[PDB]
């Protein structure tokens, strides 16, 4: 038996990331519904809006984020939300299912049969991919936390942000934090170099994954005849994101050529 206590923070970025990471949300899933791709998609979007609200609260607590121009803050969240949602879905699916099942929430796990329904097959393959890479690379929780912050900071307007210099500084702090997370494992210098290379390749690969997923998100959002619903938060973000995406304004910040 031990007394109740809050965990001990330390003066490191990863320690703060651990305390501000939002708790995993339950979907409040009514599993009595029949299996259908359209119903599943709506359910996922309603969960997604709740996760995005939690992610906005998380971003506000990231050191320096709130010091960027308010427009930069909105833009970064509009450009990165899908990255944040898919990477966290990847983490849950890796930790709970070794990347074999889509773990949206503890009460919403999409199995192989459901993932292979006619109109689920393609999108689920894309959604599950990053989980298989987290599994392959055996990513640690500290590595994951640092990488997830880098994803908030991986896409910017082509013309630059209003607070560009500060943004570059913040981004470099998390690149360095990722290196520290890798190094803490106790590998030698060569292994550290190799692992940093592999994890930054993984970060870069997120852009093509997200392109695959935004194609579904935007088409199901726009074609109202499909009757796939989105909550207000998400609908607003998507409404604002599409014009930037389609005008080619979303610039990816790649580590590698």
């Amino acid at each position: 038996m031990v007394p109740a206590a809050l965990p001990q923070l330390t003066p490191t970025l990863v320690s703060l990331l651990e305390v501000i990471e939002p708790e995993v949300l339950y979907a409040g899933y009514d599993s009595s519904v029949p299996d259908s791709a359209w119903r599943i998609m709506t359910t996922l979007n309603m969960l997604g809006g709740r996760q995005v609200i939690a992610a906005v609260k998380w971003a506000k607590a990231i050191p320096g984020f709130r010091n960027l121009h308010l427009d930069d803050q909105m833009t970064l969240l509009q450009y990165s939300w899908m990255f944040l949602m898919v990477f966290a879905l990847g983490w849950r699916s890796y930790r709970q299912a070794s990347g074999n099942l889509l773990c949206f929430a503890p009460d919403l796990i999409i199995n192989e049969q459901r993932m292979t329904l006619p109109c689920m097959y393609d999108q689920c393959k894309h959604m599950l991919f990053i989980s298989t890479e987290l599994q392959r690379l055996q990513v640690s929780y500290e590595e994951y936390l640092c990488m997830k912050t880098l994803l908030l900071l991986s896409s910017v307007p082509k013309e630059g942000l209003k607070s560009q210099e500060l943004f570059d500084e913040i981004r470099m702090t998390y690149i360095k934090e990722l290196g520290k997370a890798i190094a803490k494992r106790g590998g030698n210098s060569s292994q550290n170099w190799q692992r940093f290379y592999q994890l930054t390749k993984l970060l870069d690969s997120m852009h093509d994954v997200v392109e695959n997923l935004l194609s579904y998100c935007f088409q199901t959002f726009l074609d109202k005849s499909m009757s796939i619903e989105f909550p207000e938060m998400l609908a607003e973000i998507i409404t604002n994101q599409i014009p930037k995406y389609s005008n080619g304004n979303i610039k990816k910040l790649l580590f590698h050529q």
């Binding site: 803050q73 909105m74 938060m233 607003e236 973000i237 409404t239 604002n240």
Partner: peptide, 10 residues
């Protein structure tokens, strides 16, 4: 155009 997200951020 960004009411909800702006509200959360403030």
């Amino acid at each position: 155009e960004n009411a909800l997200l702006r509200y959360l951020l403030d």
